[PDB]
Design a protein around this ligand. Structure first.
Ligand code: TMP
Length: 239
């Protein structure tokens, strides 16, 4: 595939979003749930890619969960409990903007999880996801990669953006210094939890338009593959 100008990007995006709406109706009709994980550094473009992914999908059929730090009430349970509570029904879509993989990313880097906790978490997470995918759930995980210089450009845009500058803090700037550790943790995560039933898709995120298109294409492709594995064929169930 090639990069496209804005008009052709818009047309390709519109077709892919129609196909995503159709795929949602297909998964609902066949009562197969869909779980999408998004991870990546601050300003990697997770939020915008999610917005394009579900923009034309029926709002009754999905929930986007913006995941932040566990609250004190959530820490009274196992770290996966707050995520168990958010799982979609069969036939519904759940999007996790950050996810249980925080156990092996920010919580590992910041020392919130002990060494034993994050060390054993890879197989705990594999086993959890396998429970779901052996039943009636499809899981895809996306890592949006962004360069340090592109992230810096986006931080400066945010600090000049009246809708976003209130949220950018000195702590975020300082956390940019921890990026090497995050990259190492993400690479170990990829090595240990990239599974056939629950793949990691690495998304080239420096160009937002390409990232949005790729997220849509990869979601649709894995839905079609998993449909085939289940003896079903994705067709147009809209018209
Ligand atoms: C998303 C997330 C953040 N955190 C921590 C990191 C920071 O100390 C704090 C706020 O992070 P945030 O500003 O990126 O949401 O919460 C966790 O411990 N676990 C998580 O899953």
């Amino acid at each position: 595939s090639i990069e496209l100008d804005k008009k052709m990007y818009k047309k390709k995006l519109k077709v892919l979003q129609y196909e995503m709406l159709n795929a949602q109706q297909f998964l609902l009709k066949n009562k197969i749930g869909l779980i999408l994980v998004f991870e990546g550094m601050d300003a990697a473009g997770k939020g915008g890619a999610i917005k394009r992914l579900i923009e034309r999908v029926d709002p009754r059929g999905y929930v986007v969960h913006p995941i932040s730090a566990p609250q004190p009430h959530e820490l009274r349970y196992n770290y996966l409990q707050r995520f168990w509570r958010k799982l979609p029904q069969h036939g519904q879509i759940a999007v996790f903007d950050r996810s249980w993989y925080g156990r092996v990313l920010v919580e590992r880097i910041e020392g919130f999880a002990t060494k034993d906790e994050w060390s054993r978490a890879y197989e705990e997470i594999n086993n959890f996801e396998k429970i779901l995918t052996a039943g009636d759930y499809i899981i895809i995980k996306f890592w949006l990669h962004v360069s340090d210089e592109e992230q810096l450009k986006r931080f400066k845009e945010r600090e000049q953006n009246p809708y976003k500058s209130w949220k950018l803090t000195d702590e975020d700037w300082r956390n940019r210094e921890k990026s090497p550790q995050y990259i190492e943790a993400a690479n170990e995560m990829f090595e240990k939890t990239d599974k056939k039933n629950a793949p990691w898709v690495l998304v080239a995120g420096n160009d937002k338009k390409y990232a949005r298109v790729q997220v849509l294409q990869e979601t649709l492709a894995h839905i079609e593959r998993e449909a085939l594995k289940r003896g079903l064929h994705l067709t147009n169930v809209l018209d």
